[PDB]
Amino acid sequence: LQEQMDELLQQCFLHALKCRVKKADLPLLTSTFLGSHMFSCCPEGRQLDIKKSSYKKLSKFLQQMQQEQIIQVKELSKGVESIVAVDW
RNA sequence: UACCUGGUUGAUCCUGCCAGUAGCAUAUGCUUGUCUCAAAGAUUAAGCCAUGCAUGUCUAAGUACGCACGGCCGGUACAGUGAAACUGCGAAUGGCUCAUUAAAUCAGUUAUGGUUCCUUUGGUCGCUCGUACUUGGAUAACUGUGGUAAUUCU
RNA sequence: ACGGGGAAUCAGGGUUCGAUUCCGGAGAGGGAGCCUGAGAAACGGCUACCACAUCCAAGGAAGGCAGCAGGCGCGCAAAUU
RNA sequence: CUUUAAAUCCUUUAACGAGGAUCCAUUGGAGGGCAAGUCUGGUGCCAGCAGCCGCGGUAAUUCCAGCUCCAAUAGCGUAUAUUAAAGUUGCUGCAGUUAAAAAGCUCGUAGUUGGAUCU
RNA sequence: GCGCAAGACGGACCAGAGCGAAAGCAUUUGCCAAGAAUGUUUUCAUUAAUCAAGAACGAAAGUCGGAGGUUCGAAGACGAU
RNA sequence: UCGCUACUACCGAUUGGAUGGUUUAGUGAGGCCCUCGGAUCGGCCCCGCCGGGCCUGGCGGAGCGCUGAGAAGACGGUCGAACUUGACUAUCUAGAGGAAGUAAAAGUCGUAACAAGGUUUCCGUAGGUGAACCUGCGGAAGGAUCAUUA
Question: Strand F positions with any atom < 7 Å from protein CB?
Fold first, then answer.
């Protein structure tokens, strides 16, 4: 279900990676963004877990989403997965 | 050696702890003339490991036609030391570690009349009524031809 | 947390420690399955699979120090190829 | 020389080898616990000591140093586990009116405990 | 002042007095079952003491249903300081 | 109670980042055993060709005749390593969102408590308030009365 689920996910999740409070371009954790479903005091109705994707890890999702000229990736020394979006 | 002192209050007697005190082991700092002993990669990682060594073995008495020696006397079947290879035996002990393991291991205690036992010791070993003055084939060391980059390969 | 014989401390009673030279048990990186033999479910024997890691002419081949030394790592913490 | 597989060390022995900073003893202390200074100079609630109580805000018996002396001594300080001290885990042996503490009250199975009496 | 009604509560007597396992328990009268102490030259003959598990009761407030609402009265509302 | 500087643990939407230990269905490397199985290697005769005194040495060919040995490979079972599959579960870790506690600082705001603490204090409940706290009902003295007259 990567078609459907990555379409919904990356649609509403990139749109929630681009404006504000959707964060524009900053290094930030993808988790915080996945649990960020709210825009303008309502949920996006988008609730999805990344477990619904073809990526059994977030590192692989960051392997694909970084390959698309959308995000750039780095790993913090604490071990979180930190992404710096391409402003497109 | 059957032991206690300081700390609550303006002062007192308490309950009561904190702190002091003496060992004991592991670490550690400073210091170190003599001599006897002596633990020592256990704690964390039963984590990982170059290099070298740690299990081989023949008497008189299982098999010698390697000249490898010498060796004497030379038709003596084999004189004698003897590497190797076949055979026999050992390599299950020793050494190291403490991960597992809670009536499991272990200790004391009993049992095998419910079983196995190389070896050592002593017994037994013409008790069977039916080519032998000696039997059969093969294989190793050895000789030689070889292969593979590479082995205690073949 | 391997168990004992024991060790330190002790009036009398106890507490705590026992990996460690003696006895017994267990295991040879993790599990499993065997040959050989009087005696192994052996590891300085074998067969795998996992995890490591060596050589390679890329076809294949060899691995097991919780044996003595010694090296890395870990660490407050431990000796001579 | 001896020792020993071969050496080492010890023992045994010739030769040299002891008068001042040498052939020199150091580690912590010196308010109270706790043994031993109302010393001398520097610091002035700073730097710092101090296990605990405490010391330090211009005469510091407690800091930094010099002098003195005191404890063990070829040894003595730290940190940590642990034993005694601890009659502060109490079987020997503690406690529970007010200090920490007796259940709101009674019934009740196990558990624990049980009167005399038989030469 | 006369009558009527409703719901509460039993003054004084009431005490360092009584009764109950403890909470607690005071108007009269009857009914119902208990109970201690006392008395006993009655009977059974150790049936007993204390109690984990487990059970019975448990002031006030509080909570659900019902009835009832006089007094007092948290909440609330004023008036003052 | 607040409000400033730090402190910790504490829960907590989640994904991470690590792992670790288990269990279902589907498989199953290898051994050991079971019936097979028989590449090829031996003897026995079947004969010839030769030699020695029926016996005996060769050689050659066959007769799938007989028999003995027997490698690879395969069926089945078994022991069972380790895989795929989902379902599980305990740690660390970061943890967005919070909590609360503490430790300070003469900032507030008060004055609850200790005297009869200025309205006795405290207990259990229940409601209410910026904050201590206040008020109902029932209790205690740890009360401010060991006592009050027929």
Answer: 13-18, 93-96
Nucleotide nearest to A50 (CA to C1'): F15
Estimate in Å the CA A80 to C1' D44 gap, whole number: 54
Q: Which nucleotide is nearest to A58 (CA to C1')?
A: F16
Question: What is the secondary structure of A44-86 as a DSSP string?
Answer: -S----GGGSS-SSHHHHHHHTTTTTSEEEEE-TTS-EEEEE-
Four-CA torsion A31, A70, A6, A54, nearest 10 degrees:
-70
The 10 Å Cβ neighbour count of residue A88 is 9
Number of helices (H), then strands (E), in chain A: 3, 5
Task: Name the residue with tokens 């109705």.
Answer: A45
